[PDB]
């Protein structure tokens, strides 16, 4: 079974794959969510729009994309394919 992953391999990719259809879908999924997160942080001081900044407990200075991928792991997001 998956032993405690570390660094860039966490969360396990194979568990993310079941939350999407193909690897490419996960790429864009996570990238768009990361743009949303970075945008919340960047313009949090002013009147944030529909951007829902972090949803899973953010790390102290967790990189945006990492928060996004973890959110996808916890089934905290939804997507509509092209």
């Amino acid at each position: 079974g998956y032993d405690t992953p570390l660094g860039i391999t966490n969360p396990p990719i194979d568990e993310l794959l079941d939350r999407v259809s193909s690897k490419y879908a996960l790429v864009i999924y996570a990238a768009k969510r990361a743009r949303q997160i970075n945008d919340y942080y960047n313009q949090l001081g002013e009147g944030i729009l529909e951007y829902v900044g972090p949803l899973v407990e953010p790390g102290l200075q967790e990189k945006p994309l990492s928060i996004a991928l973890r959110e996808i792991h916890a089934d905290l997001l939804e997507h509509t394919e092209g």
Partner: peptide, 7 residues
């Protein structure tokens, strides 16, 4: 929607 409300 569920997580959005949970924010």
């Amino acid at each position: 929607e569920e997580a959005r409300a949970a924010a």
